[PDB]
């Protein structure tokens, strides 16, 4: 669970020392990024359903075979589409968690760790989720620091998948 405050305390405790001005500057950077991150999390939360549906539709457009090929790993039926929308919602919600926490820790703990075994086992191609994340990047309509931090989390997820 990687966030600036927890990482600062982990570094100080590993060396067995009190929090010096280095950790205070870390906290200052966390405070500087925090409000932007929280409004971005709120903006993503309010526009979550449309973003998830559009990302799922974009994946279906980029990979049409997922919509008519039979099999458990495809979205040919309604169950597969529900699984796809649920996964994209998981991605978006954990990204908002990362924005709230100020680090990739929620993605690392909830989604990134073990996702390779998931996709290999259930024959889900990571390129689908990469397309969903790219749609989210292009369409969240954020700006400035909020956009930069949210895009950092989405690119972190993309890099993990690719």
């Amino acid at each position: 669970m990687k966030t600036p405050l927890t990482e600062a305390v982990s570094t100080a405790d590993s060396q067995g020392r009190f929090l010096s001005s280095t950790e205070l500057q870390i906290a200052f950077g966390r405070l500087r990024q925090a409000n932007a991150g929280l409004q971005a999390a709120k903006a993503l939360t309010d526009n979550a359903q449309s973003l998830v549906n559009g990302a799922a539709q974009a994946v279906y457009n980029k990979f049409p075979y997922t919509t008519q090929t039979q099999g458990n790993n495809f979205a040919a039926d309604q169950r597969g589409k529900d699984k796809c929308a649920r996964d994209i919602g998981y991605y978006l919600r954990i990204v908002t968690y990362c924005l709230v926490a100020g680090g990739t820790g929620p993605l690392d703990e909830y989604l990134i760790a073990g996702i390779d075994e998931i996709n290999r086992t259930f024959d889900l191609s990571p390129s689908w989720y990469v397309e969903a994340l790219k749609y989210i990047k292009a369409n969240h309509g954020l700006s400035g620091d909020a956009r930069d931090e949210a895009n950092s989390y989405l690119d972190y997820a993309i890099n993990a998948l690719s």
Binding site: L19, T45, T96, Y97
Partner: protein, 172 residues
Amino acid sequence: MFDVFTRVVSQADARGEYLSGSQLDALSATVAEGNKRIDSVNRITGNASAIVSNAARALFAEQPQLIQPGGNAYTSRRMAACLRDMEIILRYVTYATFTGDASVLEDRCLNGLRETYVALGVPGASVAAGVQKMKEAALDIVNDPNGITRGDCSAIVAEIAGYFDRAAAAVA
């Protein structure tokens, strides 16, 4: 471990829901309190040696039997172990104040500490008394109005006091 943000994040993920508007506003209010939190951490850190030494001196003045021969704090090694324990408890209290969550204090300092003291014969009640003396000295240092931007630091003082009480109760 957890900080203020990560605790709410973990709870929301267990619920499988986005952080609500109320939780986001509460976290923003915590962020607005952040400068005072950093000042509190800095002030306790800058006087940590004084806090530990003065609290130890007061503890051994009101409990002379600790430093009498045959007492637990008697001999340099034990006495130094006691000072070091007090410093460690204070350091993890500062960690908890910095992160705003008690997870670091519980997981890395107080986990099994009572059992360690029971095994060694260290009087846990006297450790709690030393922790309380650290608490009072630390809170006075955090609330000192000289040379700082005036404002209401009651919430951070209460949170630090809660961490100190938690450390004292883990060993008492």
